């Protein structure tokens, strides 16, 4: 399973 | 012995029109389980090995969202580094992300990974603790001191140390039958001449999995490493492995020669003659 | 912009006997970036259909592709892949050999 969460560089 | 748990993703821009190519493929050890594909129809998290279909709408639906999300999260990014680097928008460039999680043989954490590469250039690692980065030039110190800011390192590692693993653990179970089993290298030796006085004698690994594996010549019991070629390991397509190593030989002297192997698959290692 | 050329392996799934069904790989990697054009030639003419690997990457960040078809070998019969990548002036062939 994937990260749920992502942050933009 | 050990596991891992990947997921790679890969976005490229296309200048002129539209949204950027996004690829998106996860994998438990060598074994591909999972795939997203912007260009497809679908436009969902679609299943690439057999035990993950046992898994329920719940987890496609999940899957599917997520994934979009990191689809759009790698969209603004491009532009972000465009911004960065002073790009115009006339060329095509890329964005790569990959993470996830190492167990050792009591399938405990012992390892997590994430990073960013642009263009195919590093760009933005976490480090080994799981509580800092390494940025690669000034571009991407900007993004570290962002996420710090932010608090992203501590996010990463409950799911790199946490979830990760739950998942990983959860999938060696359902694939237990393919991802708990080793398939040792069938081996054997061929034999080429070259002159009336120089042969070529190649050992070959076909089947084996996982794909790591170490082939070695020995001439009277020692290493030769000269007049020796080695293949890149290679998919089979059928989810093994393949790779060979060839040594040149006077002709007549193809007994001093052994070929050594050495897999997970092998209790003790193999010696060929030919 | 970091550019590397593909490296090739041509090879069968299984081992090669004439007659008998079969598939025919095109193994591409250590590329950059990531757009690249990879055919299946049967006795010089493209292949028509030919699946391939989602793209996926290595540690060091390059890009490898499978491409493959079904194929029966003969003794008359010669295969080959054709590669074409930014970082290359013309199509790169590589011929088929059932002992590389």
Known sequence: ?9 | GSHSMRYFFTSVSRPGRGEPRFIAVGYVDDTQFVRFDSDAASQRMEPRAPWIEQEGPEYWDGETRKVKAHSQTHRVDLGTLRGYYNQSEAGSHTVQRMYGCDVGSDWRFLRGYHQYAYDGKDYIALKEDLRSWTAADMAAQTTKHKWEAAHVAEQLRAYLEGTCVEWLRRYLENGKETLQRTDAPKTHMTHHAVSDHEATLRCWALSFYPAEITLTWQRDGEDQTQDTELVETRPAGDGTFQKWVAVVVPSGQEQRYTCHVQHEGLPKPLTLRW | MIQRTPKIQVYSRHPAENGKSNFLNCYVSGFHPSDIEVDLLKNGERIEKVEHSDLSFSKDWSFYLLYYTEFTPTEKDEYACRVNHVTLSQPKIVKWDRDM
């Open chain 1, 1 to 9: 399973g994937i990260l749920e969460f992502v942050f933009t560089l």
